[PDB]
Amino acid sequence: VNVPKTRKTYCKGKTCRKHTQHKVTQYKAGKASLFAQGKRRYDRKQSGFGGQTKPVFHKKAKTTKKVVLRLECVKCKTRAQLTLKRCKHFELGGEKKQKGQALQF
Amino acid sequence: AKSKNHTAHNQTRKAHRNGIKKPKTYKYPSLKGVDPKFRRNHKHALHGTAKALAAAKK
């Protein structure tokens, strides 16, 4: 689905506590990194013999992912999340619908 | 292994052995999930009306 890049939603950040302009960006998990205990704990278990110690997942049934909108409040640059129902298409940009015009040839 | 799937047979006959005991209600029911505003108001009312009977009637 289409959503617009702007959204005047509620903001909680001490000074705000009211409805303000947010900049609406797609969440993306970023890098996973070592040094997390849960990674180290894994690596240590892995090392040596036995081989694959932990369950590797296979049976995927979902095609899509649920979408998350990282919002940034323009005033205090304090952020917040918002999650939608699932979908295949997505565009955080514009291109709004036209009312009832003719089909493209 | 085609086993019997479901029935409600001989269930009522279990039920009536101890037998559908009713809720057993109390005067002064539990104000839980009653309007918050109302509850707040009633609180203050009770606080006040206690005072009236406590301080005056002696």
């Binding site: 049976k59 995927k60 493209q104 040839f105 | -």
Partner: protein
């Protein structure tokens, strides 16, 4: 427990490939769409396509 041996010729590369698996377990299916582009002049090694 019946297996299935497919033979499939690539869309892109073109080579002739085969597989054999029991048929319940999934072979994950790619998703396909046509862009119906209109082709203007072909420049250098690329083509040049015009969406309507």
């Amino acid at each position: 427990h019946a297996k299935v041996h497919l033979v499939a010729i690539d869309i892109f590369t073109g080579k002739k490939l085969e597989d054999l698996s029991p048929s319940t377990h999934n072979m994950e299916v790619p998703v396909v769409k046509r862009n119906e582009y209109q082709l203007l002049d072909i420049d250098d090694g690329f083509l040049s396509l015009m969406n309507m």
